[PDB]
Design a protein around this ligand. Structure first.
Ligand SMILES: CCCCCCCCCCCCCCCCCC(=O)OC[C@H](COP(=O)([O-])OCC(O)COP(=O)([O-])OC[C@@H](COC(=O)CCCCCCCCCCCCCCCCC)OC(=O)CCCCCCCCCCCCCCCCC)OC(=O)CCCCCCCCCCCCCCCCC
Ligand SMILES: CCCCCCCCCCCCCCCCCC(=O)OC[C@H](COP(=O)([O-])OCC(O)COP(=O)([O-])OC[C@@H](COC(=O)CCCCCCCCCCCCCCCCC)OC(=O)CCCCCCCCCCCCCCCCC)OC(=O)CCCCCCCCCCCCCCCCC
Ligand SMILES: CCCCCCCCCCCCCCCCCC(=O)OC[C@H](COP(=O)([O-])OCC(O)COP(=O)([O-])OC[C@@H](COC(=O)CCCCCCCCCCCCCCCCC)OC(=O)CCCCCCCCCCCCCCCCC)OC(=O)CCCCCCCCCCCCCCCCC
Ligand SMILES: CC(C)=CCC/C(C)=C/CC/C(C)=C\CC/C(C)=C/CC/C(C)=C/CC/C(C)=C/CC/C(C)=C/CC/C(C)=C/CC/C(C)=C/CC1=C(C)C(=O)c2ccccc2C1=O
Ligand SMILES: CCCCCCCCCCCCCCCC(=O)O[C@H](COC(=O)CCCCCCC[C@@H](C)CCCCCCCCC)COP(=O)(O)O[C@H]1[C@H](O)[C@H](O)[C@@H](O)[C@@H](O)[C@@H]1O
Ligand code: HEM
Ligand code: HEM
Ligand SMILES: CCCCCCCCCCCCCCCC(=O)OC[C@H](C)OC(=O)CCCCCCCC[C@@H](C)CCCCCCCC
Ligand SMILES: CCCCCCCCCCCCCC(=O)O[C@H](COC(=O)CCCCCCCCCCC)COP(=O)(O)O
Ligand SMILES: CCCCCCCCCCCCC
Ligand SMILES: CCCCCCCCCCCCC
Ligand SMILES: CCCCCCCCCCCCC
Ligand SMILES: CCCCCCCCCCCCC
Lengths: 51, 143, 51, 54, 534
């Protein structure tokens, strides 16, 4: 009765939209991502370069 | 309004004549109790003051040409001649009070010179004016 | 709640009136990375009755 | 195209509304000037809601 | 593939009748029956943005020299808490966005509950049998306020630190055991070690757990009473008229759910909140002019401002002036919690009410509510009366006196006006039932009498003059557009006129539709009558 099965475009775009929303929500988790091969800021100290 | 459109010509022509006297008498007469030169406030605002009366007079004149003899404009008219409908008058509304409150908010906004207050007051006024006009148009609640 | 730092006056300590100069730690980078020294820096300084 | 709600008038020696003239002395009714009121309570579709408390 | 997943999920949980019951629950549709969802969605955002926020935050008071993203404040000695909170906004990618989302969500949460409580109060949804819900909810709002308070005190900046100084000195100045209690909470003199630790462990665990538990209990208890609704056509006190859980309610809940989520995501970016980099580390000597706690905590601070210097000296002991503030706030809480009991003592009516009541029909309660709202608002304004005084060019002493006097005459005027307006609304409601809708058709009769056309909502006797319909507890129409006498009768797009062929049928179909709807609604009414006479 929802008549959603007939609307291929609506449900297709809705899937994409929902996926993009989900990815938008979880995106700030990329603040945790750090490059292991980027030396820490400042000159090399007695503990090395951080790598 | 047969006579209403006509009586405005009186003030119109009067003020038009005074405005032209004013300009010529102020720029060419040295009195000793003032200086010589056209005055740019009593001239513009008296030329354009005649403009208002002319505008209203002409509009009412064009309007009154294409109106029939109304019972209110007829000298010997029976009370039963206007028997009918006098159009639509709003019985009640809360929106005049609201939009007065909105102009008050914008007023204090400008007084204190707070940008947020001016902005809010401006859009608080648009809303209330909109609701005033759409009062009798609000559709039956669709479920 | 009876005591503050001024109670040191009672037990024969000489406390001055220390004005806050809001001094911060100083960066000193040399051959072994960067370090904040905060030595030789005094944030409280003595004050005179003409100051 | 002419709106359904537009009053049924002869388009000959008569105009219902122009720039400056009209047929009423006042504002035209927003529910059709040719609408006859009042009507029967049935047409309004108002259902008086019987309620009992407690 | 789908027929078989259900088959082997039902064969082992016998859940066919249990699930069918849940998906067939009917919920009343009213815009004011959604305000509770806003609190729920904001709470979900808080606990989700909060968990992300704890991966970068160190709640330690240990002093360090700052070297980080914020190039100012480099070399400045601060706590470990302040340095990490300053790092989650200048060194974490999208950390300021999440921090601001968190704070905005906190604000919305408290306002999502306050407005909800107002809806519950005004409509009378706290009556029998719904008093556990009222008590649970009241505890929810107090704990929400407490949670918010200990949340913005975590960064340990200069602004929040003064709040803690105020709070500690409120506790310490309590009769008899305010000294021992203060030392038991902070673990010593203020500030102390294990002071940002006890607060951090009670803001991310103790309060959340308590709140979640109360919320879950609250919702389950609501689902058991299957809501309440306004009086209307066909709806009695032993039924619910609305929409089923699926497919209509569940989708609407999600739609509104993400709407709130998306709105909080907008403010988190476009609007600054709690700019802690401008405030500096906490120092007991430094203070600022605008030291207001937060909007939900303003009323407590406003109470402290308008309380006169009324100290009681008792020889070797003293009662501070702020003690009376505590007493007053305690009374306000007690009055709020035990409202259903006080309302039913003075009304003498406890009769298992399932039908709501419009605020206009309960003038005493409505007026008490507006009286209390003015009290709360005046306390809130007095709480930030130093920013009011400067920005609006008013004497600060005058503001204090306005707060002091206004707490007595403000509530009184609010009650009077509100009561009169409630009765006024009642009167306007009776004119329509007695005479009909005032149409704007001022006809002139042949004699010259100007008469307004009245549209009866009921049967007339002989010559107009409608038989007066009795009040029914529902909203009476007041305009002729509320009966669809202004409905646009031209189907099509903005430019598209739409073929008449398809335009005739659609108007006919909608006409038959609302006829059938009205018929079914009035049949429901009739059923109730002949059911209530047995
Ligand atoms: C002096 C100044 C006078 C101002 C007071 C008048 C404001 C009245 C508010 C309108 C709401 C009430 C209403 O709808 O009708 C009454 C309505 C009953 O009539 P009704 O039969 O339901 O028909 C009305 C319609 O339903 C209503 O039609 P609707 O269904 O289409 O409308 C729904 C809704 C619209 O839908 C929305 O939700 C709109 C969302 C808002 C958009 C905002 C855009 C920005 O309406 C609103 O919420 C409009 C409210 C906006 C008013 C803004 C103007 C306020 C002035 C600003 C002053 C600020 C001062 C700051 C304080 C300073 C302190 C130091 O309910 C009430 O009785 C409520 C009473 C409200 C109090 C009025 C008495 C004031 C006395 C104060 C003493 C001075
Ligand atoms: C689509 C749905 C898919 C299912 C997932 C949804 C998760 C929760 C389900 C909520 C909807 C059911 C709501 C409800 O109240 O109906 C009860 C309904 C039976 O209703 P009923 O026939 O009227 O039973 C009469 C009484 O309720 C019987 O009462 P009683 O006296 O026998 O005591 C039972 C009482 C339990 O006892 C008490 O706590 C009462 C306190 C006693 C104190 C003394 O509560 C229950 O009925 C337990 C049922 C729920 C089990 C816990 C939820 C499991 C989800 C976690 C698994 C996911 C990870 O039970 C269910 O629907 C079974 C739950 C199915 C869980 C599926 C397990 C996961 C497998 C997924 C694999 C996917 C491939
Ligand atoms: C910026 C402005 C933005 C404000 C817009 C708020 C949007 C609220 C949404 C809305 O309009 O919902 C539709 C709502 C009707 O809902 P409905 O679903 O169509 O009807 C359901 C039932 O029929 C139930 O409806 P009802 O027929 O029973 O009428 C409901 C009406 C009850 O009717 C009354 O009797 C109203 C009398 C109370 C107003 C008197 C104000 C006293 C002034 C204090 C003076 C201090 C000195 O409302 C109340 O329950 C009153 C509760 C809140 C009063 C708080 C007023 C603020 C005082 C704080 C001063 C600072 O329209 C209203 O009636 C508006 C009232 C909602 C709260 C707004 C507060 C009143 C504004 C007055 C202050 C001036 C503003 C500046
Ligand atoms: C159920 C139920 C409660 C039934 C009522 C029956 C009953 C026995 C009631 C108790 C008696 C009664 C009517 C009143 C008691 C009043 C008293 C003595 C209350 C003291 C309670 C107490 C320890 C309060 C703590 C102090 C509080 C709440 C201070 C408020 C406060 C806090 C907590 C801040 O954090 C703050 C931060 C920044 C600025 C300002 C403030 C602020 O003012
Ligand atoms: C559940 C479905 C999961 C689907 C995943 C899709 C989710 C979309 C959002 C993902 C988060 C954002 C993606 C990229 C975000 C980004 O741009 O980060 C850079 C990027 O990485 C690189 O370059 C190399 C490429 C690495 C790929 C990155 C994409 C992440 C995907 C592949 C991993 C998730 C999939 C796993 C499933 C998860 C389930 C859990 C098991 C790091 O360069 P960097 O230079 O270290 O920058 C530092 C500052 O970030 C930092 O603040 C610091 O302050 C700076 O110092 C600086 O170092
Ligand atoms: C944590 C914040 C709160 C949340 C998330 C919440 C959630 C809800 C929800 C989802 C409902 C279902 C009906 C509706 O939406 O109106 C509801 C109903 C209710 N809530 Fe709340 N609520 C909260 C706070 C409060 C407060 C503070 C009170 C009372 C002081 C309260 C008392 C009630 C009552 C009486 C109902 C029943 C309404 C009815 O059944 O007609 N709630 N709540
Ligand atoms: C229960 C509802 C909650 C409310 C009302 C609330 C309120 C707040 C507020 C107002 C702040 C200050 C944020 C700022 O500085 O801008 C804050 C900070 C914080 N909250 Fe919450 N919070 C809640 C729940 C949670 C939960 C469940 C967690 C953890 C699981 C959490 C973890 C944090 C953390 C880590 C901070 C860090 C301080 C900061 O980075 O500013 N909160 N909270
Ligand atoms: C019976 C109703 C009585 C109305 C009281 C009006 C009394 C005001 C007189 C106070 C005074 O001028 O004597 C100063 C004295 C030297 O110092 C004191 O001891 C202070 C006395 C404690 C008063 C705390 C009042 C707390 C207020 C809230 C609890 C109420 C909010 C609701
Ligand atoms: C509900 C109770 C709230 C408690 C407040 C207590 C009362 C004290 C209020 C002090 C007001 C200070 C005003 C002021 O100084 O103005 C300004 C300072 O604060 C503000 O900007 C007020 C922001 C308030 C939100 C307005 C947002 C407008 C966008 C609307 C889009 C939907 C100074 O003027 P300015 O910003 O330069 O234009
Ligand atoms: C009615 C008194 C008017 C004041 C004197 C009028 C002066 C006439 C100006 C004529 C100037 C000729 C250019
Ligand atoms: C050098 C004398 C020129 C005088 C011109 C007078 C004009 C005044 C009316 C202007 C109307 C503008 C709308
Ligand atoms: C034709 C027999 C197989 C289909 C019967 C329905 C399977 C059980 C559905 C239970 C639904 C619970 C979610
Ligand atoms: C907390 C006590 C409530 C008492 C409310 C009385 C309000 C008095 C207003 C004056 C009413 C004049 C008729």
């Amino acid at each position: 009765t929802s008549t959603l099965g007939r609307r291929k475009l609506i449900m297709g775009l809705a899937g994409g939209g929902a996926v993009l929303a989900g990815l938008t929500i979880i995106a700030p988790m990329g603040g945790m991502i750090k490059n292991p091969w980027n030396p820490k800021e400042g000159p090399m100290d007695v503990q090395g370069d951080g790598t | 309004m047969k006579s209403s459109a006509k009586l405005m010509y009186g003030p119109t022509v009067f003020m038009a004549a005074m405005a032209v006297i004013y300009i010529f008498a102020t720029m060419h007469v040295s009195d000793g109790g003032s200086v010589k030169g056209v005055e740019w406030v009593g001239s513009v605002a008296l030329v354009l003051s005649a403009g208002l009366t002319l505008m209203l007079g002409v509009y009412l004149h064009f309007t009154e040409v294409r109106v029939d003899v109304l019972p209110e404009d007829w000298e010997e008219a029976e009370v039963a001649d206007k028997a009918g409908t006098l159009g639509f008058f709003s019985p009640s509304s809360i929106w005049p009070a609201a939009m007065s409150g909105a102009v008050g908010f914008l007023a204090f906004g400008v007084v204190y010179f707070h940008y947020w207050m001016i902005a809010v007051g401006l859009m608080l006024l648009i809303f209330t004016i909109t609701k005033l006009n759409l009062q009798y148009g609000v559709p039956k609640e669709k479920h | 709640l009876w005591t503050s730092g001024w109670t040191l006056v009672e037990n024969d300590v000489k406390v001055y009136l220390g004005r806050d100069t809001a001094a911060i730690a100083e960066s000193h980078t040399d051959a072994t990375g960067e370090h904040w020294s905060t030595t030789g820096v005094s944030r409280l300084v003595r004050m005179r009755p003409e100051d | 195209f002419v709106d359904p709600a537009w009053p049924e008038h002869n388009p000959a020696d008569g105009h219902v509304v122009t720039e400056l003239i009209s047929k009423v002395a006042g504002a035209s009714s927003p529910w059709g000037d040719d609408k006859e009121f009042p009507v029967s309570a049935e047409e309004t579709g108002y259902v008086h809601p019987y309620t009992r408390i407690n | 593939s789908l027929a078989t997943v259900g088959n082997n999920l039902d064969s082992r949980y016998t859940m066919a009748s249990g699930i069918r019951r849940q998906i067939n629950k009917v919920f009343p549709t009213h815009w004011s029956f959604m305000l509770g969802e806003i609190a729920l969605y904001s709470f979900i955002v808080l606990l989700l943005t909060g968990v992300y926020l704890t991966l970068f935050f160190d709640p330690s008071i240990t002093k360090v020299i700052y070297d980080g993203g914020y190039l100012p404040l480099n070399g400045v000695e601060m706590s470990r808490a302040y340095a990490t909170a300053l790092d989650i906004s200048f060194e974490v990618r999208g950390g300021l966005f999440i921090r601001q989302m968190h704070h905005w969500a906190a604000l919305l949460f408290v306002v999502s509950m306050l407005v909800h409580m107002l809806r519950i109060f005004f409509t009378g949804a706290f009556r029998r049998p719904r008093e556990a819900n009222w008590i649970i909810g009241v505890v929810l709002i107090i704990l929400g306020m407490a949670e918010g308070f200990m949340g913005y005190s975590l960064p340990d900046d200069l602004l929040s630190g003064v709040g803690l100084r105020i709070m500690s000195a409120i506790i310490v100045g309590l009769p008899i055991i305010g000294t021992w209690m203060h030392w038991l909470i902070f673990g010593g003199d203020f500030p102390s070690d294990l002071m940002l630790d006890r607060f951090y462990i009670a803001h991310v665990l103790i309060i959340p757990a308590i709140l979640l538990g109360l919320i879950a209990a609250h919702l389950a208890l609501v689902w058991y009473q299957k809501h309440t609704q306004f009086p209307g056509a066909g709806r009695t006190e032993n039924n619910v008229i609305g929409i089923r859980i699926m497919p209509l309610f569940a989708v609407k809940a999600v739609a509104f759910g993400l709407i709130v989520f998306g709105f909080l995501a907008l403010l988190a970016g476009v609007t600054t909140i709690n700019a802690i980099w401008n405030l500096g580390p906490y120092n007991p000597s430094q203070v600022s002019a605008g030291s207001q706690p937060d909007v939900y905590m303003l009323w407590t601070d406003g109470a402290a401002r308008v309380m006169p210097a009324w100290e009681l000296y008792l020889g070797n002991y003293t009662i501070p002036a702020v003690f009376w503030v505590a007493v007053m706030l305690g009374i306000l809480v007690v009055l709020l919690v035990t409202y259903p009991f006080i309302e039913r003592k003075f009304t003498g009516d406890d009769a298992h009410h399932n039908l709501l009541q419009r605020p206009r029909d309960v003038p005493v309660r409505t007026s008490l509510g507006v009286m209390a709202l003015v009290f709360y608002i005046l306390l809130t304004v007095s709480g930030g009366n130093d920013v009011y005084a400067m920005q609006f060019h008013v004497s600060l002493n005058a503001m204090t006196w306005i707060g002091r006097i206004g707490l007595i005459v403000g509530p009184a005027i609010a009650y009077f006006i509100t009561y009169r307006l409630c009765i006024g609304l009642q009167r306007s409601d009776r004119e329509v039932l007695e005479h009909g809708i005032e149409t704007g058709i001022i006809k002139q009769m042949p004699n010259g009498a100007f008469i307004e056309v009245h549209q009866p909502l009921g049967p007339v006797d002989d010559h107009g003059h409608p038989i007066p319909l009795p009040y029914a507890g529902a909203a009476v129409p007041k305009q002729m557009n509320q009966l669809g006498y202004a409905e646009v009768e031209t189907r099509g797009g903005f430019f598209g006129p739409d073929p008449e062929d398809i335009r005739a049928k659609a108007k006919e179909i909608e006409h038959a539709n609302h006829i059938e709807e009205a018929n079914t609604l009035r049949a429901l009414n009739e059923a109730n009558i002949e059911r209530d006479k047995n």
